[PDB]
């Protein structure tokens, strides 16, 4: 009850006369709604991961994935998952988020070169074949492909860049066949200080596991809430209004009440922000409707007591809130502090300081005893 | 006098987030201090008037 909350706040079993800012009240969401676009065609992950031929590591294939539902459960079917390293995202949460764009960098490397496919790594493949950005967000999936990328006489169709003048920049592909030059003497052909940058892998089944070919696909994501586009397989629900709910608008998670908006978004605009960069409005992915977002009602809770030795009776002030909203939240049981004070009808008063419950408003004027605010004071009187 | 302001620490730092609130519990009584200071400021404003 409020008196016990005051006792715990003061850390004393005895409470003196006064008003104590004890806790905070909050209206709780009643439903959880998610709005996801009409898109239903599954992303072509099978084509990228089960391609007949994979490009060389120095010529890594960047597939573009957009405008589809990214169901990652398919990836668990045709993959032994030797490496499943997700950086910046949780692999278990991939099914709930919205990604602006998907980039699939697919290539084939050696078994021991898998660890080189990571931001901040060093090595032949990392520096001269494929380099990831320092702020890379996404996942890297590496799996053995010896049964499909090895030949008895040697698979020379796969080449890697071993020599280069400078280390490869992130998301940079080098396909130049110029002979590497060591020093200042120009190179006109194979010979002294001249080496071919591209070396054939020569994958063979008889080789060891560390030398067996491995297919590596890097899924790069642009986790932005404005363009949405590619999201996971979540069933969109109906849209409720004028009710405090947990909303998931195309990956944007929040809590509040959504109302009709007079804001006129330009066609390219997807959401609205306030002077202090707080989200004021959103656009429904389905109905293209402009919805104002208002966080659910909350505020301070103060307890007025005459002193625990005078009486155990208390009054509660919910600060800066209309008595109607407090009563409505109590009716639906949405208030965070759940020790509801008994309401009689004369026990509920509306001050400019908020809603006062448990104190009877009289028309007489006395000297202030317990300051409530806005000229309103409380006192324990007959 | 000046404007009397009240701050909810949990809302400001870890708004309706339970994980953040549990992490914030590790920092001790900084926020009780802040609330006490703001309450003293407000009471002083009323006393000034």
């Amino acid at each position: 009850d409020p008196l016990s909350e005051t006792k715990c706040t003061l850390k004393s079993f005895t409470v003196e006369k006064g008003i104590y800012q004890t806790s905070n009240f909050r209206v709780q969401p009643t439903e959880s709604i998610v709005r996801f676009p009409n898109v239903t065609n599954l992303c072509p992950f099978h084509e990228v991961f089960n391609a007949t031929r994979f490009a060389s590591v120095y010529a890594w294939n960047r597939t573009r994935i957009s405008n589809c539902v990214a169901d990652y459960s398919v990836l668990y079917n045709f993959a032994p998952f030797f490496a499943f390293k997700c950086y910046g995202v949780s692999p278990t949460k991939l099914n709930d988020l919205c990604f602006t764009n998907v980039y699939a960098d697919s290539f084939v490397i050696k078994g021991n070169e898998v660890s080189q496919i990571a931001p901040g790594q060093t090595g032949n493949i990392a520096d001269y074949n494929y380099k990831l950005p320092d702020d890379f967000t996404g996942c890297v999936i590496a799996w053995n492909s010896n049964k499909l990328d090895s030949k008895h006489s040697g698979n020379y169709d796969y080449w890697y860049r071993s020599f280069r003048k400078s280390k490869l920049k992130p998301f940079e592909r080098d396909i130049s066949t110029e002979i590497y030059q060591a020093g200042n003497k120009p190179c006109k052909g194979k010979g002294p200080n001249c080496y071919f940058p591209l070396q054939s892998y020569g994958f063979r089944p008889t080789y060891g596991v560390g030398h067996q070919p491995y297919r590596v696909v890097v899924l790069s994501f642009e986790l932005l809430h404005a363009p949405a586009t590619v999201c996971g397989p979540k069933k969109s629900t109906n849209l409720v209004k004028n009710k405090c709910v947990n909303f998931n608008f195309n990956g944007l998670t929040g809590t509040g009440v959504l109302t009709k908006s007079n804001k006129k978004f330009l066609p390219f605009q997807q959401f609205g922000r306030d002077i202090v960069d707080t989200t004021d409005a959103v656009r429904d992915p389905q109905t293209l409707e402009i919805l104002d977002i208002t966080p659910c009602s909350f505020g301070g809770v103060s307890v007025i007591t005459p002193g625990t030795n005078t009486s155990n009776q208390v009054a509660v002030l919910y600060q800066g809130v209309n008595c109607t909203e407090v009563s409505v939240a109590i009716h639906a049981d949405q208030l965070t502090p759940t020790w509801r004070v008994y309401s009689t009808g004369s026990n509920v008063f509306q001050t400019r300081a908020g809603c006062l419950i448990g104190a009877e408003y009289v028309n007489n004027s006395y000297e202030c005893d317990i300051p409530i605010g806005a000229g309103i004071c409380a006192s324990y009187q007959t | 006098s000046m404007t009397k302001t009240s701050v909810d620490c949990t809302m400001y730092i870890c708004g309706d987030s339970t994980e953040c609130s549990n992490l914030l519990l590790q920092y001790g009584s900084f926020c009780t201090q802040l609330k006490r200071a703001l309450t003293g400021i407000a009471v002083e404003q009323d006393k000034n008037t």
Partner: peptide, 29 residues
């Protein structure tokens, strides 16, 4: 003379009214 106010109230920052209203201050004066 004393939205920004809505946003300030939107994350834990509330403003408490003074105990004495402007009418009472005018009465005292």
């Amino acid at each position: 003379t004393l939205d920004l106010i809505c946003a300030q109230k939107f994350n834990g920052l509330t403003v408490l009214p003074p105990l004495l209203t402007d009418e009472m201050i005018a009465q005292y004066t």
